[PDB]
Amino acid sequence: HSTQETAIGNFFSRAGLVSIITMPTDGYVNWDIDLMGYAQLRRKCELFTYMRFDAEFTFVVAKPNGVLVPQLLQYMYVPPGAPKPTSRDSFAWQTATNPSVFVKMTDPPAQVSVPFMSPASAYQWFYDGYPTYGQCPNNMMGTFSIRTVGTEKSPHSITLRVYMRIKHVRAWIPRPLRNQPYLFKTNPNYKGNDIKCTSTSRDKITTL
Amino acid sequence: HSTQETAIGNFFSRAGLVSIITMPTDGYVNWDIDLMGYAQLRRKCELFTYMRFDAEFTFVVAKPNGVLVPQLLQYMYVPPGAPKPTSRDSFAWQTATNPSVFVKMTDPPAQVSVPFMSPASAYQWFYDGYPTYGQCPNNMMGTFSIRTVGTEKSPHSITLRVYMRIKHVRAWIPRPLRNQPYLFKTNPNYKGNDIKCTSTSRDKITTL
Amino acid sequence: VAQLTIGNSTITTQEAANIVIAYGEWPEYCPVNRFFTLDTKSWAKDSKGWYWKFPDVLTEVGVFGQNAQFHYLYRSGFCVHVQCNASKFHQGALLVAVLPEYVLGTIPPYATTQPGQVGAVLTHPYVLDAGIPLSQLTVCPHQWINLRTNNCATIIVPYMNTVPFDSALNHCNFGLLVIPVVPLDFNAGATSEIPITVTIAPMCAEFA
Amino acid sequence: GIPTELKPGTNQFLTTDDGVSAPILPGFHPTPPIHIPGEVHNLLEICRVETILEVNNLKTNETTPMQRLCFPVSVQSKTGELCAAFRADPGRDGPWQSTILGQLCRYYTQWSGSLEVTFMFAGSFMATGKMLIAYTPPGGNVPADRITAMLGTHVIWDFGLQSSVTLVVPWISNTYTTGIITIWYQTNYVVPIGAPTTAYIVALAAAQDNFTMKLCKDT
Amino acid sequence: GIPTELKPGTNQFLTTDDGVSAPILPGFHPTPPIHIPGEVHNLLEICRVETILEVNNLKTNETTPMQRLCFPVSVQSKTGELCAAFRADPGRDGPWQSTILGQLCRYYTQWSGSLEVTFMFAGSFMATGKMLIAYTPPGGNVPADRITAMLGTHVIWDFGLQSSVTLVVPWISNTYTTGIITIWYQTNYVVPIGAPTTAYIVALAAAQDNFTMKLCKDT
Amino acid sequence: GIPTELKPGTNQFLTTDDGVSAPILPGFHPTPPIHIPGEVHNLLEICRV
């Protein structure tokens, strides 16, 4: 009756997991924002050529088995082009231009909305030419750096999982959906030795 | 004086318990949404033939004896037609189309409202014909999957109880209330060897 | 006395304006035209009751029944006319009632859930073979045949379903119960078995 | 931010509150409703239909429970005697448990209103006679004679003309106030050659338009 | 301050809520959009384009999968026989997995609407003949004769005049209701001197303007 | 959401406050009042006898 569930906003809603980060007993992690890490949301985003949106992250943080301890954490967002932290006690942790959030483990999870961060007018997953070496574009949404505050070591293993919604989606120039398995995370390199057919076979053309 | 307490909304309000789920020290549970599990709310719902509503669940979670521990929990709602999780570490736990809630044990209980989820225009408790094997309909409201987050095992026995209100009730085609005891949970199979009379006996017809 | 001729069928019934309209709604269009006089049942001194399933009762007769195995879809009302032929020296009382989604119980095979044109009998008529008591059957559209006063009983039933079109082969919409609440009695020498005649006329039939 | 303050009653789960909740599927658009005949808006629409009282609820009818719905009048009974007697309490046990009114009063606590009891003769067309349907208000005693029952509220019912009579109980209440109804043989049961000598009466009961009930309760 | 009170559902993270969040960079002004041609507002715009069905999906075509798109008509086939047969279910396996309609139905649960199947003759200009495109509604059986298939819904397609015919499936639904389509040799395949004796047909399929789907799901 | 902030005096139970509370029975409709003679609105009506 209604054609509102196939709209481009309802196709890309419903925030899903993009990364699970373990920090067991260095002392920090860097997770650069990329979406072509899972099989879903890559095959769903490669239906189009140009997409423009803004993300919204959520940081569900706990111990390796459920439990929560009163521990203070810092999630620093390094913008595209700013230098990433090198060590746990680097200069980049106190830089005023890298926005951070400070949240306990015993809180609701921290939410952060990141705007459209490209110098072009839309992200492109497919770049035909060369940027200069390989045939890849320069979308480069950012980087999340995560550590526990304080100068000595926290005796608590920290595992957080990152969820992400996609808001204000606009999409251009549709494209065939990929039927071949993925090999790498930058190029559309398929396995050329065996090619999976799109359909499943049957006995004869009349055996329905 | 007023006839507002016999209305169809006031007859089905006042959220009651529908299931109590124990998860002692697999590691997960599946409770598919059904209402014909208790003697009340089945005899109250079989007064009518067609009912249309939308539920509202509440998850009161604790330990086997009262106490609460700082433990993170996930309640995933599997929609009708989507495949259920198989194990604790299944692929279905990270699916973006199954909505989940993340809540601590030391919080207020989590509330979730589920809409009218039928392809027909009303739920029917009585289906005369055959769907294809037994004479049963295909209402199939959904499934709640419950686990503790993290990859190793939580050393805490978890017992939650599910409460459920019924909102926006519309009912059609009234029906005699059942006076015979229930045997199974799908069919109106009564015990035909002894039939309980509807009333209680007396000595003679004049002994009031 | 009138003479109702629709189609090529002709019945003779009196001017009895005791038509009960089921739930106050006439059968209409915007979601065959004859009488189908079935076989007569012999009401004896110890008969328990009978039931017919609709529209399964009209899939072994002609032109409407041959339309039932075709076209995969069906939507119509009905017009049932039950009458009894007894003298003024007989006594008894019937209760003629329709019941939507009449799902029977087991003390069930493919023969008793749809008995066909002849209709099956009731085993335990106090619980209607479904666990619901006979004392509350008058919440359905009903009509009494008291052999003292009247002989006929006619009910107008519209189409009641959660979907506007259903397959007539598997799903049966309602039933028709004729139960002797007060048993038949006479003196020795009179006619032992009294005939009960059922006449069905489909009203506002559609197929697409 | 705006200055707020938490009152007592914070973080409680009262199971009888009507508040909005978080929708689990915001993009979902459910199936729009269609017209289905027979929609019930109020439970008093089901209380106002006439269902069969079970007056013949003896101990010797439990194995054959179909006889519990009809009680007999016969030819060997002398005139001026008692045929049946039952109270007028829908919520208590006895005959009113078979009705739909006596089953929907188990789901509530207090009720008040007027009923109507309907009788129906199911005998031969050639038989005739008279009965007396006497009603006793709450507080008074059940009559022992036919003549003392006539001096109260009563209806003379001959089934040679009307095969069904009605009787209105004026008021009942619940917070013993019972409205005892008795059936008396006014005349005997006159019958010709060939017609059967025994006949049966069924009794039906329903509520009126001033019947309400409150304080919902679970049986 | 103002008196507030916390309801149940406090401090929960429901993963399907649409609420505002804290902007990480308030001073940032992103790049304004320009006009790029081909903006997709709705996924039904992609379902309404004609993509190639894979009817010749035999087991012996898996090593050379280019032959799966075209199925042959030849000169040694007698008249009145069957050329191809396939169901009309986009969501299930078989021929409809190659289309864009059968891949966007794997992302949902329920769908309902009308399709349209398009055939296209890719033979020589000098060849002529006739085919019969029969459609069977759900519930009926597949025909065994050409004459029984003619009595239903069918289109006589001669490729001496029209090189491409269309066929509209009236309704499908999903909550077996399949709309089996069969191709029958009406005549044989007439060919002159010099033209090739075998030719190929491709089959295309798309949805119509009353095709909707709901209840999003992840494959 | 809207930015709020908790002031001191949060989570206290002052026994002399007049605030609304959660009704235990929302569907209940109590008995309407009738006229009873001799209603006392003020305790000074009893002091003046």
Automatic annotation (TrEMBL), chains A, B:
GO BP annotations listed: symbiont genome entry into host cell via pore formation in plasma membrane; symbiont-mediated suppression of host gene expression; virion attachment to host cell
Example GO molecular function: structural molecule activity
GO terms under cellular component: host cell cytoplasm; viral capsid
Main location: host cell
Domain Picornavirus capsid VP1: 1-176
Keyword flag Acetylation: no
Compartment annotation: Host cytoplasm; Virion
UniProt keywords, alphabetically: Capsid protein, Eukaryotic host gene expression shutoff by virus, Eukaryotic host translation shutoff by virus, Host cytoplasm, Host gene expression shutoff by virus, Host-virus interaction, Lipoprotein, Magnesium, Myristate, Pore-mediated penetration of viral genome into host cell, T=pseudo3 icosahedral capsid protein, Viral attachment to host cell, Viral penetration into host cytoplasm, Virion, Virus entry into host cell
Keyword Lipoprotein in record: yes
Annotated function: Lies on the inner surface of the capsid shell. After binding to the host receptor, the capsid undergoes conformational changes. Capsid protein VP4 is released, Capsid protein VP1 N-terminus is externalized, and together, they shape a pore in the host membrane through which the viral genome is translocated into the host cell cytoplasm.
Assembly and oligomerization: Interacts with capsid protein VP1 and capsid protein VP3 to form heterotrimeric protomers.
Family: Belongs to the picornaviruses polyprotein family.
Protein's name according to its UniProt entry: Genome polyprotein
Lineage, broadest ranks: Viruses, Riboviria, Orthornavirae, Pisuviricota, Pisoniviricetes
Part of the intact protein present: 638 to 862 of 862
Automatic annotation (TrEMBL), chain C:
Compartments where found: Host cytoplasmic vesicle membrane; Host nucleus; Virion
UniProt record similarity statement: Belongs to the picornaviruses polyprotein family.
Its biological purpose: Capsid protein VP4: Lies on the inner surface of the capsid shell. After binding to the host receptor, the capsid undergoes conformational changes. Capsid protein VP4 is released, Capsid protein VP1 N-terminus is externalized, and together, they shape a pore in the host membrane through which the viral genome is translocated into the host cell cytoplasm.
Assembly mode: Interacts with capsid protein VP0 and capsid protein VP1 to form heterotrimeric protomers. Five protomers subsequently associate to form pentamers which serve as building blocks for the capsid. Interacts with capsid protein VP4 in the mature capsid. Interacts with protein 2C; this interaction may be important for virion morphogenesis.
Annotated protein name in UniProt: Genome polyprotein
Source organism of this protein record: Coxsackievirus A16
UniProtKB/TrEMBL annotation, chain F:
Natural source organism: Coxsackievirus A16
Family from the record: Belongs to the picornaviruses polyprotein family.
Subunit text: Capsid protein VP1: Interacts with capsid protein VP0, and capsid protein VP3 to form heterotrimeric protomers. Five protomers subsequently associate to form pentamers which serve as building blocks for the capsid. Interacts with capsid protein VP2, capsid protein VP3 and capsid protein VP4 following cleavage of capsid protein VP0.
UniProt function note: Localizes the viral replication complex to the surface of membranous vesicles. It inhibits host cell endoplasmic reticulum-to-Golgi apparatus transport and causes the disassembly of the Golgi complex, possibly through GBF1 interaction. This would result in depletion of MHC, trail receptors and IFN receptors at the host cell surface. Plays an essential role in viral RNA replication by recruiting ACBD3 and PI4KB at the viral replication sites, thereby allowing the formation of the rearranged membranous structures where viral replication takes place. Capsid protein VP0: Component of immature procapsids, which is cleaved into capsid proteins VP4 and VP2 after maturation. Allows the capsid to remain inactive before the maturation step.
Annotated localization: Host cytoplasmic vesicle membrane; Host nucleus; Virion
Superkingdom in the source lineage: Viruses
Identification of the protein by name: Genome polyprotein
Range of the intact protein held here: 324 to 372 of 2193
